[PDB]
Amino acid sequence: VSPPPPIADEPLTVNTGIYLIESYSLDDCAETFKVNAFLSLSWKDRRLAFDPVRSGVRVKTYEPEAIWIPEIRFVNVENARDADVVDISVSPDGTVQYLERFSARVLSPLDFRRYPFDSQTLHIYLIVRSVDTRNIVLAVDLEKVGKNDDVFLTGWDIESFTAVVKPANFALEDRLESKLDYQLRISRQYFSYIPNIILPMLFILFISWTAFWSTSYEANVTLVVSTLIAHIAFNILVETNCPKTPYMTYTGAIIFMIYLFYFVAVIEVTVQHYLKVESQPARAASITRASRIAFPVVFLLANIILAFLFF
Amino acid sequence: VSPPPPIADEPLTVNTGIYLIESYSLDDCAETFKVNAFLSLSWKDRRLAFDPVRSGVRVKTYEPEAIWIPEIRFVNVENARDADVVDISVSPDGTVQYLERFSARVLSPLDFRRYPFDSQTLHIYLIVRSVDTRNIVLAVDLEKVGKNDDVFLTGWDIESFTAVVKPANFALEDRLESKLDYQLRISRQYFSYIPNIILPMLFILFISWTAFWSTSYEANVTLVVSTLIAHIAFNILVETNCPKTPYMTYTGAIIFMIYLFYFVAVIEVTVQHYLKVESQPARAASITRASRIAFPVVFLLANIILAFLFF
Amino acid sequence: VSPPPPIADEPLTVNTGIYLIESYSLDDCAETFKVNAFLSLSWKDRRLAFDPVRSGVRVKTYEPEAIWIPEIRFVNVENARDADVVDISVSPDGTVQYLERFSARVLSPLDFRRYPFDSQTLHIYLIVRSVDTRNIVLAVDLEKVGKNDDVFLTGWDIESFTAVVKPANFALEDRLESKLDYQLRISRQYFSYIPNIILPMLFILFISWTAFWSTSYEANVTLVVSTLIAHIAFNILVETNCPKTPYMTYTGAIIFMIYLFYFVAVIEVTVQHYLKVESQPARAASITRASRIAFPVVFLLANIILAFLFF
Amino acid sequence: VSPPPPIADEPLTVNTGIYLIESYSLDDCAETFKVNAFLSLSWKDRRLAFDPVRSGVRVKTYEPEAIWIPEIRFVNVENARDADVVDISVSPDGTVQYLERFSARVLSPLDFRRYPFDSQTLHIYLIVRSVDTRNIVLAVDLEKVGKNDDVFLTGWDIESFTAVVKPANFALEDRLESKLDYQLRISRQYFSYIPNIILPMLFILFISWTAFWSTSYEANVTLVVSTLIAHIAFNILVETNCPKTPYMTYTGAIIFMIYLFYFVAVIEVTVQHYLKVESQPARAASITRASRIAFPVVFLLANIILAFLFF
Amino acid sequence: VSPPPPIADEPLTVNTGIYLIESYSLDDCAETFKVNAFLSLSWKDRRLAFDPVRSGVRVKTYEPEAIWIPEIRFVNVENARDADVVDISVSPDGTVQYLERFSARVLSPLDFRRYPFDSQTLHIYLIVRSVDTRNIVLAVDLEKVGKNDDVFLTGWDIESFTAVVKPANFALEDRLESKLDYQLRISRQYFSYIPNIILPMLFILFISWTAFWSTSYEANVTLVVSTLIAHIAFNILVETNCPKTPYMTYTGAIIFMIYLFYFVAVIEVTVQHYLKVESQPARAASITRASRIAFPVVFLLANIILAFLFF
Numbered sequence A, B, C, D, E: 001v002s003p004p005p006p007i008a009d010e011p012l013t014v015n016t017g018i019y020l021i022e023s024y025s026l027d028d029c030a031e032t033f034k035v036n037a038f039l040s041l042s043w044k045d046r047r048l049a050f051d052p053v054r055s056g057v058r059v060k061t062y063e064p065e066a067i068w069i070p071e072i073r074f075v076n077v078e079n080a081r082d083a084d085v086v087d088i089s090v091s092p093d094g095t096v097q098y099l100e101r102f103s104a105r106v107l108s109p110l111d112f113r114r115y116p117f118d119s120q121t122l123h124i125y126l127i128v129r130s131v132d133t134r135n136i137v138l139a140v141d142l143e144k145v146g147k148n149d150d151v152f153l154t155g156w157d158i159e160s161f162t163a164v165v166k167p168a169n170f171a172l173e174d175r176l177e178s179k180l181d182y183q184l185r186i187s188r189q190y191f192s193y194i195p196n197i198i199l200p201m202l203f204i205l206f207i208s209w210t211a212f213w214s215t216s217y218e219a220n221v222t223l224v225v226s227t228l229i230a231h232i233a234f235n236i237l238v239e240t241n242c243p244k245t246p247y248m249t250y251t252g253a254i255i256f257m258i259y260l261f262y263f264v265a266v267i268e269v270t271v272q273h274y275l276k277v278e279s280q281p282a283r284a285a286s287i288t289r290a291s292r293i294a295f296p297v298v299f300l301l302a303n304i305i306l307a308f309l310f311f
């Protein structure tokens, strides 16, 4: 119950491996995801080395309390993982093979700028703090890094589960810390968004544009203002459940643009009626006739500019 | 507290069994359900063998700490089950009969394509990782697999609770994994859905069609747009509380179809009034008269096509 | 420790008793309630019997670990109760007086058919599984079954806390199980419903009926459709927070009836205007005049039929 | 680890004290509040008495496991408090001074009848169960009862933290129990309720009264019904998030009164138009003219009557 | 397991240091934030001092149970922190280098008066209570006080993590308490508020002002009342999820001002129409013409006055 002694000066290499069993509860708003996986750890301790000819065992199994085990922690977790040691095996040369099954709520930030067409990289940071007698450094056993085929996140396409092999070694509170990066690449399943959000939101906007084929100010006010209410009501219905994002998103820009179009269409309706009442029906009619083409064209162009700037 | 030694290299057979006591909290959105049940386990540990004559007892009872117990875990669980060992009984041959009462939040995916007429198969995967000394394989004791008659999920008809007897044995991180599939088949109780969701949503749509028995553009705009508001408001009220499904559902298709019908009815109302104002009341009136038949017929037809494509 | 040995063939009788300290968190939607109470247990274990003269003590206190204690569990709980043993006392004849203070989330179904005029019976099922050496049977002492006077559930009148004295002994997985039914009878405090939900809901409906004292189709469309919106908006405001009930409720029937009345009133308004425009103002006016009496009378009758069928 | 012995058949007096460190999470709907405080306990155990001369120390410090400590529990708590023993000190006469720092979610009912002008008394009930060897009685060390000056509840003025010195001793499950009442008096500081809820809710109602200065039935229907929608919509926005209170509140009475006024104003608008259309414009105009004074006067008076009946 | 005996009058100095690893879950409404960090503690216990020649070791490692460790607690936490001792190291002179990794939900009040342009100072109060034998005083080494570069709070700019070096030593329950103030300075990311909340809410208000370029009372009622509905609906959509603040905020003042403007615009519309109908179209037209300038000018001025009073 002291770290293994160094054969030559060099630090202890703790070989790691994460194997995803289950991925669930991806909360976009909280920027957290819950994960259930295996953590494999391999290190050599020659104090645990033995001759198989005299000892007469394949490998010696130990209790966690019995031997020295490195303290591997996660950087980006809410609280410490719920871990359960599955097996500890010691080969004759002193190579300890540790395996545990853990569940953790991982805090990983998400970029919503290209939502719902976005893709994300979920991070899991492994960390080990070096001891007095010797430095501890992390490594990746690529054979022991993977994911269950059945691993699923509803609404996401799980691309890959890989690790950045070279650790980030640095000093923290007068000790060396070796940090590893396990990445889960996911891409969103944006299909339903079109018939479910895009298309009914666009219909409401189009209904407001019928005020360009009418001269009735009462019918026109009822058209643009009632559709503005239906727009807001629709947005309450299809609300992300996510408190507003501090940065400007593609989706956010378009919604802003739609509120601007409701305001501009009211201006038009207001102008047209005032010109008609102010004995100028030539200007009133030409503005209305222009708007019939102007409104959809400006909308289509501004939308293309936005789609281009974001993607 | 090491696995029982093999006589002739044979793997240890752990006879399982799950008996549902309570099933509750089925969260459609989270694709999770909470379960309270019995887990029965039986295996032979000859190290515990005794002679009932010298012992004076025909069976021996042990504390979990006292003997070796296989590490049975569930694959699709949020965290490890809250288990409480009920009884451990050893017969003279050294056959252990283990029983525990556990509670677990099981992650099982759900297909909402045929909602609310859907049926689901809930899975519970039992798993055991083999040891260095010997391999461990799972088995189903069919006499120990069942459910309490009083087991209920509000709004579901619990068809059956069975297990796929042949385990899925496979290699993972250089060891054998014997996995079992326990299945809970449930079918939805969709009656209340007709008077609560379907009919009041259909009435609102029908109200919009009264604009085909009017020539008043002000009354017509008020009809189609106010009903569209009422539709959205109704949907906010009867909202599933489920963030939108990534795939297209039967329900989703119909709602989309309804939003399209609100838009088409506005087009009609817009066309009719423009023709009237453009000195063509013959065409205006014939379009309106056609819509009176067209709208319900196309709706009934498109609905049958949708019902066919989904079921 | 193993169970106490019997002279009398009859199994071991464990005298139970539950005393409610606090009742809180009654979730109508989840059909769960949280409870904090005392669990009293009594049984004779002659192995513990002593001579108070030679022992020098009239009563002996033991640690739960020290003696044999029956495994009492609850059938309808989310997870096993958080229990804390308060006292264990042994009398010279070997009688054990066990007492613990527990907290549990109890799953008890609720029938909303007569909501908000309903009354409910909350169940707590005590269970004990028989050992191999001897069978174990539960008993109630209704002196030991009670509740704190200050026990409260907001919006409910806590009638009684009692137990069904005859236990339900039955075989499960080749062993006997003696089950007790503890019942908490509660009745709803429905006063607030009239001034909060029922009267404002009736007012909106009556507003729609003023369309029978008008000939203005624009004012009439605005009356029936705007009130339908206000009805839905009201229902969003006074929403039960309960996902729709799979069965037909009294409340559910009436709400359905109200949506039907909104649709029928639109039909009337539509018919009246079409007859007027189709040079038939005699029929139009007689339909409107009839509706003035028909609508409230049919509403009052249909409501009485519903109230009768449900109560 | 047995209770201290009585010299002359006296019960053990446990001197208590609670010192509020933090008060937070007051949930009006759940009728719970979370508290972080110090619990001080003092009692005389002569088995711990010593001669400071021979001992060399004026005070002795012990580990909780080392000595006998009374089991103090809380009556109205969700689960048992998270406690941590800060210090245990023994003086030469054997007077024990125990101190712990605990956090608890206390269930204390709230009376909303005078909301938002209400004041509440939060209770914390201390309890001790007497033991076989001797009876245990609670006492208040008033020197050890207080609160941190920085203790705050957002939207409340924390008046006082005091205890009812005379304990409530009584029998429970054949043992005497001593109960103490700690009271936290709070008064609601919700000044912003006037500009945030009261004034916008009144403006909406006043807008409906403008239909008494109009003869246009279409404009009037649009005024009273649209404002009724805006009223409901406003109430959805400023919703307490508290499921309806079973009893009639001051706030509840006024909201009811407002819904009645919307209905009465519709009746007026309906009557006025019907009289006008039924060739009686003298009565129609006199009713409208009356309403202009009647409506605000009846509102102001009924409001005063309500304010008087509740306060 | 007694405090170390000093020769010097001065109390024991415990050098503290907090290092933020993760900051998450900042709940504006609850005025709480969750934190994951390192707690470093340094003190000298001469009883631990050793000859490293005789000992053979330059540093000694101890288990928390093995040695005396000061009881460091947090003042403003929900429950005591979930701590995990990372390392304990002793040098030949008796210096203890303690390090733990803790997670805590910190209660820190927030001032919303200047929201969404606000900045906040989050507090973490460290505290140590002095023992019988000697007083214990806290110290800050600002070298050890830091934060991970990757520490983030969505929508906030984390300015600095620091500590007020001079501890607040005071008497509590006849003992000394040394308290340290750790501060996290954050400033809000208000950009998205302009296009998401400010601008669309203004557009709706402006739409209501078009009622100053119309004489149609039906169109005007529809304008002012429908926009008031859209305003409320918008506020439901962009709702903070925060129950109203007991104090008057900048945002709160403006929203109140907007509701006043909706009411004043209704008064105008009502006055205009009544003057027109009361054969005075000169006054009606001059009031309308004035409002066109008055309304935006009064709005712009009142807004500047509010912005000045709050900032």
Ligand SMILES: CCC1(CCBr)C(=O)NC(=O)NC1=O
Pocket (backbone or CB within 6 Å): A222, A225, A226, A229, B226, B229, C225, C226, C229, C230, D225, D226, D227, D229, D230, E222, E226, E229
């Ligand atoms: C008040 C009635 C309603 C729909 C209610 Br959400 C409205 O708000 N505005 C309108 O212009 N028309 C309407 O029908």
Ligand SMILES: [Cl-]
Pocket (backbone or CB within 6 Å): A072, A073, A074, A077, A079, A080, A081
């Ligand atoms: Cl961890």
Ligand SMILES: [Cl-]
Pocket (backbone or CB within 6 Å): B072, B073, B074, B077, B079, B080, B081
């Ligand atoms: Cl498990």
Ligand SMILES: [Cl-]
Pocket (backbone or CB within 6 Å): C072, C073, C074, C077, C079, C080, C081
């Ligand atoms: Cl239980």
Ligand SMILES: [Cl-]
Pocket (backbone or CB within 6 Å): D072, D073, D074, D077, D079, D080, D081
């Ligand atoms: Cl407690």
Ligand SMILES: [Cl-]
Pocket (backbone or CB within 6 Å): E072, E073, E074, E077, E079, E080, E081
């Ligand atoms: Cl703490």
